[PDB]
Write a protein that binds this DNA or RNA. Structure first.
Lengths: 97, 149, 150, 49, 181
RNA sequence: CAUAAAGACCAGGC
DNA sequence: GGCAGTACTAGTAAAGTACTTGAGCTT
DNA sequence: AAGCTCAAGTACTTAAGCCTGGTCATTACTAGTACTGCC
């Protein structure tokens, strides 16, 4: 939802945003690439390079940590996924209850 | 007692000999009363006397020299107030002393065999401070094993 | 019977297995398998049983002298394992954990030393490379030593 | 807030809850390996049983 | 060695935007072996910075593959194991999570050709004004063109026919004043 | 009426 | 005046459960 | 040879409230660019 992820600044030149703003921006940029680069309409035996990037994009929305986590610069912590808000991989299940 | 582990350095084709004299603290930042009324961090630099000599083996240029500096800045350790407290950033700080088991060898009853029955076995455990562990335990097959880290 | 279930037969394959246990996949080299085991229990830069711990270590084996080195030797562990076999056979009893000859107070200055020896073993690796980074003899103030890892 | 939109993905993708889970929903019913072939086909380069 | 070594390549699934200094950190961690032992060549398809020029339209897309390193090293199966051991890399690529499958060199050069291929059809090449074909950039008739119908190498003049107002205007211009078709 | 983040670690009460 | 060096600044490296599985023993 | 169960081996588990304190740092390394000094 649009107002569920606001983009207001915190104080001065810093920001406090959700970790979904970095992940929904990738799935859409890995969607039309298979449609029109890749204008084919080929047999499926040819194309590899896009679903290795699009599946990589949607897995960070699915789960981070079961094969490979999604980390940010100077941060050895996985991106807070939609499942990680419920199960609490980082220890925030001890914070939800 | 910890300085004298890093002074003998032996580089091939360098021939360097680093000899030590003494450590002397420099000047402090402020006194013991401005660290609470102000935001004084009190970071006193540690300066150390050194004696090095060089005998280079790369190519004979005919020029050799031994330049000696009296004090070199290494580390930023805080100092101690006249009672025995420290300061680092803004607040007063005291490090609590540590009491634990010795850096040696011991012989306890048993560990690890809490899953099975674990009848008569004897074993040893060493506690180092840095490095890896070193255990010597037994099995029901009467064989001595080892556990590192 | 430990030797019969021991796969190694000499010094080389022992160092290979000691590297391979510390990621069970491959033998390293000729040199790193020696350097890691020397940096397990026989070097101060990675293993310091500080000079009091030798004095407490000598009384656990009924030694005469109390002075010595911080790092262990090749004669100590065998003499410990002999006492392990002797306690297993029935002679002797267990040792006291909570007795103060073993339970020692570590001072605040010794704690600052134990939080300074971590920076020393990095700054020695700094002065190794900055021995080569120096021009001829300008490497006293800053071209040798850094105050960042300490 | 309440209204929704949908993103037309050209190629469909998996849901990893149905994959890395030990009771594999596409390994028990549809007789593939429950853990092995999932770590062989999906992310990797094995092609168009 | 008794048998001649045969070097092969693999693909390294890493993070997007986190790739070039992972190759530099391959040079960092895997330093000091006095050789030429195992590494053949590192291939970095990304750039460590970005270009101001991007897509012409936001509908128009990229054929880039960010985060996918290609390293040459023998185990047989080496250059994803010891490249994930360098940090900020997603996993271990190929046969299984401990054992990749080997690929040929021509497939690797084709993966490079997927990098080299750019979007060269929004169909512009101009560099072109109503004459056919040159580029004049001096005097009155700058940003115009035509043909030198009569070439004068001795007089160093080029009689270029400018199509102004829907009408050819043959004007004699220098070599430095024009750009040859 | 809007801004003081999130997280880590420690100390404290029962 | 042009080229190279370097500094500044913006992207960026205990003790248990279940469950699996390898192996030993029979039609 | 097929197979059937059994035992050791293995990975994984979740750690009995809530509450404020203070603090502490949000990244230090690499690459490109721009500025300045020298030839």
């Amino acid at each position: 939802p649009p107002d569920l992820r606001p983009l207001v600044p915190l104080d001065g030149g810093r920001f406090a945003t959700s970790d979904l703003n970095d992940l929904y921006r990738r799935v859409i940029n890995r969607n039309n690439r298979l449609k029109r680069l890749l204008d084919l309409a080929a047999p499926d035996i040819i194309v590899r390079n896009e679903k290795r990037m699009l599946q990589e994009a949607v897995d960070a929305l699915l789960d981070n940590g079961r094969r490979g986590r999604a980390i940010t610069g100077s941060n050895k912590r996985p991106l807070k996924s939609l499942a990680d808000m419920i199960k609490g991989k980082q220890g925030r299940f001890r914070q939800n209850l | 007692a910890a300085f004298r582990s890093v002074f003998p350095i032996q580089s091939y084709s360098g021939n360097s000999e680093l000899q030590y004299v003494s450590y002397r603290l420099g000047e402090p930042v402020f006194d013991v009363q401005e660290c609470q009324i102000r935001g004084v961090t009190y970071s006193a630099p540690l300066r150390v006397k050194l004696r090095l000599v060089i005998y280079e083996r790369e190519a004979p240029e005919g020029t050799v020299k031994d330049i000696k500096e009296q004090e070199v800045y290494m580390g930023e350790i805080p100092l101690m107030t006249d009672n025995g407290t420290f300061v680092i950033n803004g607040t007063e700080r005291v490090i609590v002393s540590q009491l634990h088991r010795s850096p040696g060898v011991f012989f306890d009853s048993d560990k690890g065999k809490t899953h099975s029955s674990g009848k008569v076995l004897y074993n040893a455990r060493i506690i180092p401070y840095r490095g890896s562990w070193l255990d010597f335990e037994f099995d029901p097959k009467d064989n001595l094993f080892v556990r590192i880290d | 019977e430990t030797l019969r279930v021991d796969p190694t037969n000499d010094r080389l394959s022992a160092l290979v297995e000691i590297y391979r246990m510390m990621r069970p996949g491959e033998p390293p080299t000729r040199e790193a398998a020696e350097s890691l085991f020397e940096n397990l229990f026989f070097s101060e830069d990675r293993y310091d049983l500080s000079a009091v711990g030798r004095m407490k270590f000598n009384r656990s084996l009924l030694r005469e002298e109390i002075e010595g080195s911080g790092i262990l030797s090749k004669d100590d562990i065998i003499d410990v394992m002999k006492k392990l076999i002797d306690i297993r056979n029935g002679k002797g009893e267990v040792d006291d954990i909570d007795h103060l000859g073993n339970r020692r107070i570590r001072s605040v200055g010794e704690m600052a030393e134990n939080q300074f020896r971590v920076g020393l073993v990095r700054v020695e690796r700094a002065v190794k490379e900055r021995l080569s980074l120096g021009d001829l003899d300008t490497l006293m103030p800053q071209d040798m030593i850094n105050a960042k890892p300490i | 807030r309440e209204r929704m939109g949908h993103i037309e993905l050209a190629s469909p993708t998996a849901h990893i809850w149905f994959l890395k889970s030990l009771p594999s929903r596409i390994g028990l019913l549809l007789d593939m390996p429950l853990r092995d072939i999932e770590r062989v086909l999906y992310f990797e380069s094995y092609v168009v049983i | 060695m008794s048998e001649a070594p045969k070097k092969r390549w693999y693909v390294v699934q890493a993070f997007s935007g986190f790739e070039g200094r992972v190759a530099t950190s391959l040079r960092e961690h895997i330093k000091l072996h006095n050789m030429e032992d195992l590494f053949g060549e590192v291939m970095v398809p990304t750039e460590e910075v970005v270009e101001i020029r991007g897509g012409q339209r936001r509908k128009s897309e990229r054929k880039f593959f960010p985060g996918y390193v290609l390293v040459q090293m023998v185990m047989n199966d080496a250059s994803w194991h010891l490249v994930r051991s360098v940090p900020r890399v997603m996993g271990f690529i190929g046969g299984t999570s401990d054992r990749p499958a080997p690929i040929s060199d021509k497939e690797v050069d084709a993966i490079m050709n997927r990098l080299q291929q750019v979007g060269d059809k929004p169909r512009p090449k101009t560099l072109f004004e109503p004459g056919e074909m040159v580029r004049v950039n001096d005097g009155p008739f700058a940003d115009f063109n035509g043909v030198v119908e009569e070439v004068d190498y001795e007089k160093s003049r080029l009689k270029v026919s400018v199509s102004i107002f829907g009408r050819a205007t043959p004007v004699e211009l220098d070599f430095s004043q024009v750009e040859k078709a």
